[PDB]
Write a protein that binds this ligand. Structure first.
Ligand code: ICS
Ligand code: ICS
Ligand code: CLF
Lengths: 522, 477, 522, 476
């Protein structure tokens, strides 16, 4: 039933007695459900160290991964280029999922086409799909460029992307001069960040590989910036802000911030902003190239150093205090521009905030996951705040990266209780936060089910989630925020200390039981 | 807008296409004519999408894993292949259920074989066998396993049927191989069909010779309601108030046992015709169980459905039916009284999957609204047969609409409200057109039944009449 | 007892059994406490409509006020002037409190002196305190200016501020040229906002009253901006940023943002930034003066219009969409400068966020309090979001302010359930959130005790607090935030919708009870 | 060294005009423990010089904020305009157990919110009406106190007649307190006024009531305001030792246990400054002896427990040694963990009237040295006790000015500073670890054995925090 003046949606509608009674009869009548005592006994077992040992013996089953597949990254890379349509050669179900996945994180349109390879293409190849697809896409959506990636079907059957595109031009489906960079992006290799790396390297090759005779390093006095797979709009913005504040000429190569943030002014803009084609063609004339997330830009780095001959500096992701410091100093060294007083003052305001909040942050214990550069940078900042990163999980990480993060942990006493896990998933991590409980999780929205699981054991076992990473689907507009630079460090610090103080308020809200510590002032 | 203006709108939109795509898309676009006896004479459907045109369709895996199998709550469903498909489809669909997730229910979890290149090169059957053992160890309360094939499985020649047979006999567990690779078919639709056949061949007959379940003359099954936002629960409560016993829900909040008990019911109640008519026809052929279509969107259709359903039983069910209709009459009358004056005359365009583009029309009309355009991602001729009867004359119909077409249609028709999916939502908000998600219900619902109509009405009003739509033009522009 | 590797502070130390047992023995032995049944019975009564009627019949008792006293505002005003020492003529206890109060909100040093009037000054007046005080302050802390306010003792005994200051210069305690503007700031009139207005008008008079013959309106091509009592650093910064973005010449009169945000770089800076004396002397030559918070700038308005002859435009506080629009349009009209595309886009991004979040905000019911301009701007924006302000409390509001806010409510359907309260305190508000429960409170840290009270009745009666306003003492660095302009509207919107989603997650986190609605995507 | 400390004092004083220079000189001294009377070296408890940015508060803070405010089942009216009670609402962490708004009222702000009509015509009628409203809306309160703000005595109101008349009319205890901020020179006179108000209006109500039976082991904890739970971590040790703590003045204090205090056998005085007045009164009127003790750190706590037990029989002395044996592994584990992290570090303190000397032993228990200490409002007898506790040639400052304290710190360069909220953010910007030694920086308790663990953890976490190595940018 409904009271018209106070309508109930599913929560709390189905808590009504008549709904509750109906659900009890459905369970007892027809569901053949395991007894609740058995359900309770098994849940408790899944929280034990015995279960954790069996859990970590998995070799074939993956449960609740913390990674996606390559073409998702290729699409995001492609979107950062002016009037560029991402085009995934392969099956169409993939593109529906890529678009919806990004739709829900950015709350923006995400334009991407497929060429809808079906069983007929499974048997005889997708060459006709590429021919008609390129012509149909160019005529219908009028991009200036089409950036081609692949789904796993097209990799397995072995479609020759280069020959297909070359024939599409040879037979007149598109002009020979229309730009069609491509990359193979197999979902069964690496992860989404690898597809970003492969797409970017393909776009850079398309515009510079056969054009090198004219180029000379440093002649355009700019620094190239390659951001990598990046899903916070504030991170594109703060890098551009800091460089302009320094008066540093730069080119951000792949810049989706305009097309992921168009105004609602009565018109839909399929394309907006983006790195220009001329900027890719001229990029070899830069002083150097800075890679913001180098642990998933290895193929890009080999091309930039081997072909552009840029001495790419060994910089960590500019996260936290030390690594933002090192980023600005290297940019200053390369550009010849001093670090201006405005940034020095901003640095000092972050340190001021660290002195202000250090007593609540000290010793706080965290589990966290995400992509390798993000995770490494988060680990470094937690150490700088006097926190303890206890469970560090990176599903798409590798052994070289793990060695680097272990060395960062070994160099601070706040790392003494930390362990780095590569190739493990969020069902592994669930066991870790039961058997070795931290204070909070820092992670993406999939973390909410772990928090739900910890609370079911009891309120004193609950591990609250702090949402930082990708994807974030169950809060609005956090994609607008920042994690890089002094600005991102300030934002992360503020979120961390106020998460601590919110939970302490929750724990001290009980009148005449715990509210002796419900202080007005913290 | 006249029939001739709509026809000319179709032709003008089509001029942008190359010749091959123009000639094909023309077949999938039409001005409604309710008098034509066979819709295939007016619009073509269930064909391959044209390459590069930004279709909105998904794949057969979405139709099998995301739609039909995924909701079954006490089974474990493996997304078999590389990591992407199961991650993008983890908890994206709101097929609600009651359970202890990770212990006895598993719907919002992502189980996967996370294929690497060695699995592509040498095959994944050995890995699948080891994964099944790992599932049994770490999730002992699961009541069956399904293997949801992603694109590479049939391309590399794996044999998941023999794995499911050998392992199923080893451990005396139900293991269901599903060949729903995304290159099959042209949309989600073939995934439904493959999934229905997998239920038929591997689950549905398992109690054929067990006569121990106690039947009653009033046993029914809800077929094709996936309990989005609780839709199936707000339908079930009415059927049981009317005196029936809902033995099974396929597959929203569904358990494997109630699927196995379904061949024992007296009448299959089909909501989603598109996704479940196949198994309904099978159960009539094999078990003699009749099936009927019904509609629980809005008061007009719900009342008509309750009476048509009760007419298949005795006078006592028919009496309880009128008692239910009388109980809820002031409730939906109060909803109309509040919300119809706020919505009257407003015009809606819809684009959804295989059922709701026609099924929700009556609910809009109960609030005084008019559906001036509708269409489907993956419906068939029999769906459009039913649609042309429900839509007004000279309205616009679009099968497997392209992104370009839908945007141009909207710019010409200027609806007051668009009902479609997540990939459409943020396009049309930028244009200043109120938009409601008609898959996910925009995280609201239920919309089925009497309790759902109140929420439906509230939601259409809150969005169509929201103050934010007056604010898109800066006053200095 | 303590385990040395897991040391417990007060919470949870005192939940140990031996402490619990001891506290039970203290209570039973010596506190003669009311029986818990009686305590429960009385508590329930304080949540009733009967109690509310008696509560609202108070004429003499005030309980948990939502205002402070005048000189606190005078001190904040004075801090926005270059090298300026706030100086409160009167008793020193006041200045300890003013400094501490602002210390806890800003987490910054707050410099301010007293001249330590004691009972001797009570008998014979405070003239010698002013003479020695001005000399000592100038000698020791070397300000360029001393802005004098008063404590209530100095007002009651009737110290002649002007004569005391004149005598200090005549007798040689300070140079005759040294600027000592002053204002009477009686704590028993108005509130802290009135002290800001009084101090500002005093400083404006000091520099311009006797020097009007030489001035011509508009001859300096700037616009004066007077911010009023403002405790968000982001609000000073967003106004300056938007005017710079338009290319509009401006003068911000009282600008404490630098002295309230010095970096931690090894040195303490007693003074930083601030409005210059030359800016105050030159302010009559502006095109016009805009008052950002007109409902507590009424003495300043009379002087700006009466003496500078500026036609001060009728603008509301620039909060929300409509009033930020009107602010920018008026600035454009006065300055002749167009509104640039960058601000038009920012506006469209706010509207986009409104369309994204409107389904979760629609119909949500709020109780809220604060100073008059802040409250009316929050009310306006809530209406624009389709929310229902229900209980609107302004302790220091007046009857014509209430009439203005009532008219804002009557112009939107979302105002139908709203009541404006003036001269009521947070004990009145506590009654309202029990008898007519809203979804949330928006207010300052004193609201946390109301939330605690509502939870004690039951989880279903709890009204969570959203912290916006002043003071905020129990979270860190929220003073860095913004509430004005499109940027502030975006921050407020994001906080409101994610507060709704956080609470919904809490209510749907119970496994197999409410977690059917624990959606990954919202 | 002594000569260098004296030259430091003289150099800092040079900024002052002659009058302030001559006075501030009397309040700054180099420690000399052999001197028998501290007034020969340093002067105290005088008026503050105008305009020098003293850190002191007023008598209302000493009465309402300090002594009366913590009494949990009474309602305290901040009587006068709105400011005083708002700035002091819940700023002091005097912890208590209660149902706030129902039977306890500590963190609430009750006020008569004077307007201009009240200043001109007097607030006595308003006070009478306010009392009736309190009684209706908070029926479980066990008494009302009237905490006078500055204007009350200036306008000539008679709150004593109101309290006598209304108190008779409603048969309730109503305590008039004349702690207007212009009285005295600091918080200190507020303590004294507040003590006299307890004496005159509350403490004698049960003089003729003989229903409560004493035991030989009855004590009262006098002058512990339970900051962060300090008094509870003190009480537990005293009752483990076999005593019965009848009352706590006034942290977590009830009015009944105050009224039962003249029945105890020994008054245990922690804060001498704020409560020696009433202790002397109870000795004179009731014959109850009092003794000073110190529960900061293991050395002083052990010292105190044994001195207290020695006033009782052999069973208490036996239980004392059993308590000391119970906690020895606990505080030895604290020392072993934290003393190596803090050894040799130097601290400067500036606090109110007790802690600038009473925490010295705790720092020394962690190997730290207190190289400078001072008080806002201590008297000669506090400095008498301080010079014995501080090392030779250390620096002492009475009612230090903002400028002196910054200059002293810059020259001395301590490793840690312990002072208040108005000091904290100055010295962090200079790169000097700072701990709040009033509010305990929202931590604590620090009293007792359980408090020592928290104190040690806190000094380590701040002195050795990584943030202090990051203040200089690498390019500067
Ligand atoms: S199953 Fe089908 S697309 Fe019938 S695949 Fe799709 S939960 Fe749609 S129009 Mo999403 S044939 Fe159900 C559907 Fe309809 S997922 Fe839901 S809303 S009524
Ligand atoms: S009462 Fe005194 S200033 Fe003895 S007014 Fe002050 S809670 Fe201080 S040094 Mo705040 S004589 Fe207590 C004190 Fe010491 S408020 Fe606390 S820390 S031990
Ligand atoms: S020295 Fe002390 S705190 Fe000062 S007033 Fe006096 S009793 Fe009080 Fe009060 S209301 Fe404001 S803060 Fe003052 S000017 Fe008056």
């Amino acid at each position: 039933s409904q009271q018209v003046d106070k309508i109930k949606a599913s929560y709390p509608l189905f808590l009504d007695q008549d709904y509750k009674d109906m659900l009890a009869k459905k369970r007892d009548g027809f569901e053949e459900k395991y007894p609740q005592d058995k359900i309770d006994e098994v849940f408790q077992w899944t929280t034990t160290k015995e279960y954790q040992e069996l859990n970590f013996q998995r070799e074939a089953l993956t449960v609740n991964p913390a990674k996606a597949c390559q073409p998702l990254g290729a699409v995001l890379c492609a979107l950062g280029f002016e009037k560029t349509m991402p085009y995934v050669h392969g099956s169409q179900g993939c593109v529906a999922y890529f678009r919806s996945y990004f739709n829900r994180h950015f709350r923006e349109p995400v334009s991407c086409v497929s060429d809808s390879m079906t069983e007929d293409a499974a048997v005889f190849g997708g060459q006709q799909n590429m021919k008609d697809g390129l012509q149909n896409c160019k005529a219908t959506y009028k991009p200036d460029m089409i950036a081609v990636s692949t789904t796993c079907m097209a990799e397995v059957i072995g479609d020759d992307l280069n020959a297909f595109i070359n024939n599409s031009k040879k037979e007149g489906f598109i002009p020979d001069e229309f730009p069609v960079p491509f990359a193979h992006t197999p979902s069964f290799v690496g992860s989404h960040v690898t597809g970003w790396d492969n797409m970017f390297e393909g776009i850079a090759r398309y515009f510079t590989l056969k054009s090198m005779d004219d180029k000379v390093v440093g002649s355009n006095k700019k620094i190239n910036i390659v951001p990598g797979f990046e899903t916070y709009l504030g991170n594109f913005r703060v890098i551009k802000r800091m460089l302009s504040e320094m008066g540093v000429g730069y080119s951000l190569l792949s810049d989706p911030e305009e097309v992921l943030d168009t105004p609602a002014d009565g018109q839909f803009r399929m394309y907006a902003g983006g790195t220009t084609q001329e900027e890719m063609k001229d990029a070899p004339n830069a002083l150097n190239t800075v890679l913001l997330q180098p642990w998933h830009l290895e193929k890009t780095k080999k091309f930039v150093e081997g072909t552009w001959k840029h001495e790419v500096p060994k910089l960590n992701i500019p996260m936290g205090l030390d690594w933002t410091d090192e980023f600005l100093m290297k940019v200053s060294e390369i550009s010849g521009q001093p670090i201006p007083a405005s940034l020095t003052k901003e640095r000092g305001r972050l340190v001021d905030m660290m002195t202000d909040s250090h007593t609540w942050l000290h010793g706080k214990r965290f589990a966290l996951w995400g992509d390798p550069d993000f995770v490494m940078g988060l680990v470094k900042f937690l150490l700088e705040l006097g926190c303890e990163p206890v469970h560090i999980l990176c599903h798409n990480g590798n052994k070289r990266w793990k060695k680097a993060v272990d060395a960062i942990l070994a160099a601070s006493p706040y790392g003494k209780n930390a362990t780095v896990y590569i190739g493990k998933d969020l069902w592994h991590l669930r066991s870790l936060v039961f058997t070795d409980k931290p204070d909070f999780m820092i992670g993406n929205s999939y973390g909410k089910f772990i928090q739900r699981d910890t609370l079911h054991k009891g309120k004193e076992f609950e591990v609250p989630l702090i949402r930082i990473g990708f994807p974030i689907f169950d809060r609005h507009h956090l994609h607008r925020s920042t994690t890089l630079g002094y600005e991102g460090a300030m934002q992360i610090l503020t979120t961390l200390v106020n998460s601590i103080l919110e939970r302490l308020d929750e724990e001290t809200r009980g009148m005449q039981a715990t509210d002796y510590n419900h202080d007005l002032v913290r | 807008m006249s029939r001739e203006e709509v026809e000319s709108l179709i032709q003008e939109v089509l001029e942008v296409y190359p010749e091959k795509a123009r000639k094909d898309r023309n077949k999938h676009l039409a001005v409604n004519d309710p008098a034509v006896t066979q819709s295939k004479k007016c619009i073509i459907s269930n064909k391959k999408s044209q390459p590069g045109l930004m279709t909105i369709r998904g794949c057969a895996y979405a139709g099998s894993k995301g739609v039909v199998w995924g909701p079954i709550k006490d089974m474990i469903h493996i997304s078999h292949g590389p990591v992407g498909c199961g991650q993008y489809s983890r908890a994206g669909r709101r097929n609600y259920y009651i359970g202890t997730t990770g212990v006895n229910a598993f719907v919002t979890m992502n189980f996967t074989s996370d294929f690497q290149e060695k699995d592509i090169v040498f095959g994944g059957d050995k890995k699948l066998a080891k994964l099944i053992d790992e599932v049994e160890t770490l999730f002992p309360l699961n009541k069956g396993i399904s293997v949801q094939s992603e694109c590479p499985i049939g391309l590399i020649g794996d044999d998941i049927e023999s794995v499911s047979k050998v392992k199923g006999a080893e451990l005396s567990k139900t293991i269901v191989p599903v060949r729903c690779e995304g290159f099959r078919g042209v949309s989600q639709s073939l995934g439904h069909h493959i999934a229905n056949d997998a239920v038929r061949d591997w689950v549905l007959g398992k109690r054929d010779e067990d006569t121990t379940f106690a039947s009653t003359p009033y046993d029914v099954a809800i077929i094709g309601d996936y309990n989005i936002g609780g839709d199936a629960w707000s339908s079930r409560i009415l059927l049981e108030e009317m005196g029936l016993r809902c033995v099974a829900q396929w597959s929203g909040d569904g358990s494997i046992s109630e699927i196995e008990l379904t061949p024992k019911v007296k009448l299959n109640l089909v909501h989603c015709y598109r996704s479940m008519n196949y198994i309904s026809r099978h159960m009539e052929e094999k078990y003699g169980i009749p099936w009927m279509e019904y509609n629980f969107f809005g008061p007009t259709k719900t009342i008509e459905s309750l009476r048509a359903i009760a007419a298949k039983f005795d006078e006592s069910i028919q009496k309880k039916c009128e008692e239910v209709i009388a109980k809820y009459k002031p409730e939906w009358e109060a909803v109309v009284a509040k919300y119809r004056p706020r919505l009257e005359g407003k015009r809606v365009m819809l684009y959804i999957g295989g059922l709701r583009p026609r099924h929700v029309i009556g609910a809009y009309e109960d609030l005084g609204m008019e559906v001036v355009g509708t269409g489907y991602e993956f419906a068939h001729n029999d769906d459009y047969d039913r649609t042309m009867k429900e839509m007004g004359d000279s309205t616009l119909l679009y099968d497997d609409v392209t992104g370009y077409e839908f945007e141009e249609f909207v710019k010409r028709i200027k609806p007051d409200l668009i009902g479609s999916g997540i990939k459409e939502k943020f396009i049309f908000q930028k244009m200043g057109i109120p938009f409601r998600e008609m898959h996910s219900w925009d995280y609201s619902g239920p919309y089925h039944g009497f309790d759902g109509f109140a929420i439906f009405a509230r939601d259409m009003d809150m969005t169509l009449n929201n103050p934010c739509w007056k604010k898109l033009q800066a006053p200095w522009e």
